[PDB]
Amino acid sequence: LLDAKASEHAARMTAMKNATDNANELIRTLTLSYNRARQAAITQEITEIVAGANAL
Amino acid sequence: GYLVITSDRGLAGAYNSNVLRLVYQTIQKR
Amino acid sequence: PAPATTFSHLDATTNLERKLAEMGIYPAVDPLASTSRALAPEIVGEEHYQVARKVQQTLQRYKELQDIIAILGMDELSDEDKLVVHRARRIQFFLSQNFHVAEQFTGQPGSYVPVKETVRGFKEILEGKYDHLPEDAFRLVGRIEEVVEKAKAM
Amino acid sequence: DVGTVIQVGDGIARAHGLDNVMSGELVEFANGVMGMALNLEENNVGIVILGPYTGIKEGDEVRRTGRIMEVPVGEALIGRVVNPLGQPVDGLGPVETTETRPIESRAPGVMDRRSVHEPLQTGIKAIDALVPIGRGQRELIIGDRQTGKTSVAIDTIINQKDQNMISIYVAIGQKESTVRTVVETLRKHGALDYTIVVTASASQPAPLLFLAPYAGVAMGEYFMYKGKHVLVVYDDLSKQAAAYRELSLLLRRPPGREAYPGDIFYLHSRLLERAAKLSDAKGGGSLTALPFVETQAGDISAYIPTNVISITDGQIFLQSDLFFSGVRPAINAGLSVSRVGGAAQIKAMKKVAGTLRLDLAAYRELEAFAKATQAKLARGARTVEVLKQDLHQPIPVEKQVLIIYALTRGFLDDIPVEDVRRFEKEFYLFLDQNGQHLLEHIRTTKDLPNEDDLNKAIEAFK
Amino acid sequence: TRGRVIQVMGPVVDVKFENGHLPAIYNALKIQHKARNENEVDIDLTLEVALHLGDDTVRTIAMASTDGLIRGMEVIDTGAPISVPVGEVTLGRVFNVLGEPIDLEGDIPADARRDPIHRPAPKFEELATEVEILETGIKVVDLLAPYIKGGKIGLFGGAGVGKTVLIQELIHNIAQEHGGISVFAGVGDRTREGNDLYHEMKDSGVISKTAMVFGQMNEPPGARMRVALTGLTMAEYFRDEQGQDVLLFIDNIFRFTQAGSEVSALLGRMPSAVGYQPTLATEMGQLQERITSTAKGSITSIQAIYVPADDYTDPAPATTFSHLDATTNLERKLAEMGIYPAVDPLASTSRALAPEIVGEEHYQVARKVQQTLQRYKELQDIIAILGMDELSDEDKLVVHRARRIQFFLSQNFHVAEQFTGQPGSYVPVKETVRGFKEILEGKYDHLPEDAFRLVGRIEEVVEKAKAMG
Ligand SMILES: Nc1ncnc2c1ncn2[C@@H]1O[C@H](COP(=O)(O)OP(=O)(O)NP(=O)(O)O)[C@@H](O)[C@H]1O
């Protein structure tokens, strides 16, 4: 039982060590998508505004 | 008689499956 | 810009979130973003402020723990943390009310409550008198006295 | 054939008169700068300035060159660094070239092309071994900044002395420090005596940056049409796209996605469809092009990378995480493909080492998860180590295929990983004194030598 | 009775005429000139009218390079639409968009009848509708989206997923033995492929029953639109006046709409949401409403649309779904897994997926496969973050199967023999419907993860696994 209880905490250590990694990649890719969504939104907004200004 | 022991809650990884599977197989095979 | 410009003139605003509309707990007023000038000690008194602040703070605290639950599990969090959910679920469910003009959509005549019973009932729900009554019994009820009847109905 | 200039706004001008002016014609200002006409309205002509516009004033006289966009070509430009307009950069007197080519000429089409079966010797092991190239092919070099793209082009152009291919190097929007470092490297190694270098730096107006590749390909195809072989490289297409966005937005055209106008697929095509392998009606010459694209964040799904991929026949995507891992050049065994079959390589390559791509990509994926797989893992480290090479070490193709044969046949399993790169340098010191015949056999027959003798050669070294 | 040129803006020319001689839409104009002085250049040009802008002027779109157009030159109006040869004489030959031969093998005299390109779509009393299966032998396609004779099949993919590979595979598997007249319009593809297929057809003897016109990338914006129409005006005649079944292949018809966006900003129109011409839907409809079957014959066309990015919400490809009868979608993210073809099973559908046309044993397996794949798609986030070992036993068993199904969707094509150690293999419909049954009931599911990759019938899977030990 002592051997098993030590291996349990070892397995938990390993589980957290694998789990903590993919988070950062997922944040960096969402953040990139966030800046691209920003830039697209601003570009669309200015294009509409300048088209309206040119029309009027 | 057979004894099997597992972790007490989740996020333990593959600790739980690898023992329950093997104990189950080695008993129902024979 | 339209809500931003409108927000500057109201004396008291109540917000409605479509998430609450989909949850089936009507009305859909979100307690967090609903604020008023009346929440002052010289207008509502001290018996109002402490209970309102405690309920507001508990419902703010539950918001992030329920999101953590979505990934971390349901028993990896400590029992003391789980008690926050165990009571916030009841607190949010008891916010529902059976209205009188909704009889077409509900098929029910409703019930009536005065403000004294509201402050009183929230004090009891925080007191721990109703930990063992099911959460689903608190859906669309008025006065707190009805709840023990609905559990009697179940 | 007279008129006056009435607008000098932001490098674009409008001119009165000019009754007989034709589209695409060259124009000269009285200040001494060249310009061009792109639009002819009811009573005015739009002119794009190809130099320093700070000297132009209202009422200046402007004059007709009388011909379409012709750039001089010939053998006299060899040994010089030239401006796209046809002016030498480092002095050394005026050019003597007489013949000229319009850079807007119609590209060869149907009944003028042929398949590809012969390689373009690059000397960079990891490329020719995994992503082969042939003459007439257009291969995209695309990737992140600060990873070493230009170091590929320089090595490829130094290795071409033995194949007798006149070549052109084009620099766009680039810093003069790297330009002159490259020029000094070429003049030291002697490449300038058959290569032609054209530059258009970042301190130059946008229209020069926009026109540079057209001249770079027009001065290159001329030797093709006379039967010679030509290699052409461009330093960056992203900067040319940015310059075109600048010009279009000054011209008041409706922007599209990311403000890039819809002509992007058109502009590049009229530039990249000039490469071909001519039929017997003109000659057997061929031209290959290596354009460069820089990714803002290393994401392939952007507008310009995909639009530039749409024309080209392949791509190698240079990564940045590989750069800090101790591997150069950063070449990915995964998403990088060439559409030419394995027969383009010499028959020994396809015969023996054609499995290198599978052996390497499978390991590159399997390491992420990491007896049979335990043994498989041992080979990948050697598969990546043997492909490593340093700066200015273009290995001969015969020794290249020999070491690839040694790697692919499992001869290196005893050598420790950290010592692998030592074997590679000592091994060539062995053969020149013990296996000199195999090199000539490889050079002549284009085929693998006797298997028994090749296997017997190695045990002496081991 | 002659025209003039006063304004040039690149692809757009603003020709002018005199009172009473205004051309109609789609009319053809011709310009010829010879050098009067050494400073001039010789060019013969043809133009297509698109708009009327008053003051005795009409807008036209150039069909060739507009370099060297001196203002004040003369213009000739033919008074008729662009005319391209059609009929028996066009079999085996190759033309450009203007209709002239570009194969250099010879000329085609005026005795061959030629028709206008633009004509209105057939009336409702002339149309017909019937459903019957067209078969290709591809495992992934024939089950989840069978094709319909005389219908429209659409291919969707990014900037390189294997669209041309699928088109050439279909040609190798159907077009030669279908028994019908074949037309291949090389719209906007690479010129290398265009001149490669010419050898591929002539040296194989199939060129005697094929017609082609090319419009590849190098050509100015005016030409890239009408390649599809010049290809369709021949299949129309082959369907109607000869009573022959016709197959039509188009690779980059999307280059139609994009070309409009190039010219519209010069014609003088207001811009759309993302800068398109405000005529996308109407012009695409006027294009695809002529590819129809009738009571006299059937035209089956397989087309591919270039998606501008990994975003299907773009209006130009999104509005294509109003005409397709069978849909196939490609995405990079499945192509990168090492599975070819990377057809997405939860976005490719067809009208022919009905239980009275395919039988119970077909509809049942199709619905079962889609249902089983939906759950694995939904479990994506949680399996990615924490791992496949988190889920329960009943979910773990389901996890054991979806990837094997996806692997079984892979198959070696005939044009992949140059890249793979095996040639292309064939799996009939009766076999592709059968195959998924064994995996669904667990007859062969216990084999390892990679054995189901690049396989033909289900029997080859077991022998490949045995070869792996
Ligand atoms: N294969 C290589 N092996 C070793 N060192 C290398 C190699 N390639 C490049 N380097 C070194 O790394 C530096 C960066 O290479 P360089 O070719 O200038 O990158 P780059 O392509 O110009 N980046 P960028 O300017 O953003 O396009 C070079 O100056 C060399 O010192």
Ligand SMILES: Nc1ncnc2c1ncn2[C@@H]1O[C@H](COP(=O)(O)OP(=O)(O)NP(=O)(O)O)[C@@H](O)[C@H]1O
């Ligand atoms: N069965 C297969 N196995 C492996 N790779 C394949 C297979 N089929 C296609 N491919 C790959 O898919 C790529 C795409 O093919 P290709 O048709 O040339 O590009 P594309 O999708 O047509 N882009 P484009 O034609 O320019 O619109 C090819 O270059 C091959 O590398």
Ligand SMILES: [Mg+2]
């Ligand atoms: Mg660089």
Ligand SMILES: [Mg+2]
């Ligand atoms: Mg293709």
